[PDB]
């Protein structure tokens, strides 16, 4: 049904957001990367 491009696009978008945040500020976030970790794990689950 075409969920692989969806997950890939989500991963690329959140990585771009992470880079944009990294360039500008220096604040901390204890939950950073949780969504990306989950999406990558889901993609691996679809791929194995």
């Amino acid at each position: 049904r075409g969920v692989l491009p969806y997950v890939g696009n989500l991963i690329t978008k959140e990585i771009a957001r992470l880079l944009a945040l990294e360039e500008a500020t220096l604040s901390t976030d204890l939950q950073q990367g949780y969504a990306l970790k989950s999406l990558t794990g889901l993609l691996s689950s679809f791929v194995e």
């Binding site: 604040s27 901390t28 976030d29 204890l30 939950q31």
Partner: protein, 193 residues
């Protein structure tokens, strides 16, 4: 109960306070005329007030040198090395007979290890060096060999830890325990964590 800690709210405005050096002290070393101290952590020092008690006319300090650095070490002897790893903070000259001195730092210094040197001494050479009072029984002993004829004890030995400084016969500070006879020095700090 907040997920993202707010830098505005976790950082209040802590004011400066008067702390005695020995309370932050962790480790020290003493040589003939220099003193190395390590604190529990880092501190923003603003003023250092130094008090002198039980001073002797024979010798005291004319110029005091203060050094600092913000590199954490586990052994004092490692950081005892003179030239490479210190930053000078202030040079203070003392009029004769001073008991208290106010080393005012124009900029507060962030430091973890500190260094105090007696750069120059106002000295009284009228003291008799050929004949010295015995540290044990107060008997007059000649300089050579320095062994008392009343009790058989040495003169160059420390009055506190009984260590003989064979290198410097008359050191300002003891090389083993750091006992000083010429004066007793106390340190204050206008600092904050």
């Amino acid at each position: 109960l907040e997920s993202d800690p707010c830098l505005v709210c976790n950082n209040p405005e802590v004011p400066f306070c008067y702390i005695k050096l020995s309370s932050i002290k962790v480790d020290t070393r003493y040589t003939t005329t220099q003193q190395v101290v390590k604190l529990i952590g880092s501190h923003t020092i603003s003023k250092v007030t130094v008090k002198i008690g039980d001073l002797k006319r024979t010798k005291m300090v004319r110029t005091i040198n203060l050094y600092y650095n913000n590199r954490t070490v586990q052994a004092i002897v490692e950081l005892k090395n003179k030239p490479a790893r210190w930053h000078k903070a202030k040079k203070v000259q003392l009029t004769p007979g001073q008991t208290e001195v106010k080393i005012d730092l124009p900029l507060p210094i962030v430091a973890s290890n500190l260094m105090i040197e007696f750069a120059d001494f106002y000295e009284n050479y009228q003291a008799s060096t050929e004949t010295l009072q015995c540290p044990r029984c107060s008997a007059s002993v000649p300089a050579n060999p320095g062994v008392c004829g009343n009790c058989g004890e040495n003169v160059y030995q420390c009055h506190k830890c009984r260590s003989i400084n064979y290198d410097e016969k008359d050191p300002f500070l003891c090389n083993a325990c750091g006992f000083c006879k010429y004066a007793r020095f106390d340190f204050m700090l206008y600092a904050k964590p």
